[PDB]
Amino acid sequence: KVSEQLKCCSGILKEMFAKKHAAYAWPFYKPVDVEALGLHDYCDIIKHPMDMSTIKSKLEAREYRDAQEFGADVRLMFSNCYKYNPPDHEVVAMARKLQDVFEMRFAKMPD
């Protein structure tokens, strides 16, 4: 039950990484590079960063006890983006599109 849900969580992240969704998924592939983006205040505001590669490592390392912990990390990744940026920023639009894919597959997971 728990292990079968954790394979589904993996299947979902794999889809989030796929070419199909590359046009809006690409900013969340890796951790936020505050140097390159020139964001002096990002760590002051975002106390707990998250990204897709970090989540992938945690799955493969069996660190998530269940599907809810996997979800809270995906939702953390998005919440960080909405928190830091203004409503009508290109990255917030991109985040929304990807979250719709996440929420749909996460809701259709058998429990």
């Binding site: 690409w26 983006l37 020139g38």
Partner: protein
């Protein structure tokens, strides 16, 4: 204008690396061809940079506006990455003429209102006053790109 960034919104990871003795000012040409200054790099320093495909950059001395080179040439345009490998931008001094080099040093020691009080040939006054300039170069670069076409 002709020389301007493309509004691609496609990512490009870049490394700016200053291997000159000058403090470097990176200059970004925007979608309307207007130069936008970015934070400066001290000599010997480098850093990761997030830019986009088809964006134009050039590089200058932050105090004097003397032109510098990037990967042996005047302009820099990033490609898309290959297997997440960074694109490298190596910034260096060009080999100036002795004349231009003497102009730089005299400019650094004399206030512009005193240029014409120096005991030298009249034509060098004009030469001294015609400072290194981004706009002036953009026209030369534009019109060499037209001749090319």
């Amino acid at each position: 204008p002709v020389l301007r960034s493309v509004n691609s919104r496609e990512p490009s990871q870049v490394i700016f690396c200053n291997r000159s003795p000058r403090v470097v000012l990176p200059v970004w040409l925007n979608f309307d061809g207007e130069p936008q200054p970015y934070p400066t790099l001290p000599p010997g320093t480098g850093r990761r940079i997030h830019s986009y495909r088809g964006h134009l950059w050039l590089f200058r001395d932050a105090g004097t506006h003397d032109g510098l080179l990037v990967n042996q040439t005047e302009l820099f345009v990033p490609s898309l990455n290959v297997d997440g490998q960074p694109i490298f931008a190596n910034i260096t001094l060009p080999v100036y003429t002795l004349k231009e080099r003497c102009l730089q040093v005299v400019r650094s020691l004399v206030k512009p209102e005193n240029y014409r009080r120096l005991d030298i040939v009249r034509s060098l006054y004009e030469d001294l006053e015609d400072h290194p300039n981004v706009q002036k170069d953009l026209e030369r670069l534009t019109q060499e790109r037209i001749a090319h076409q």
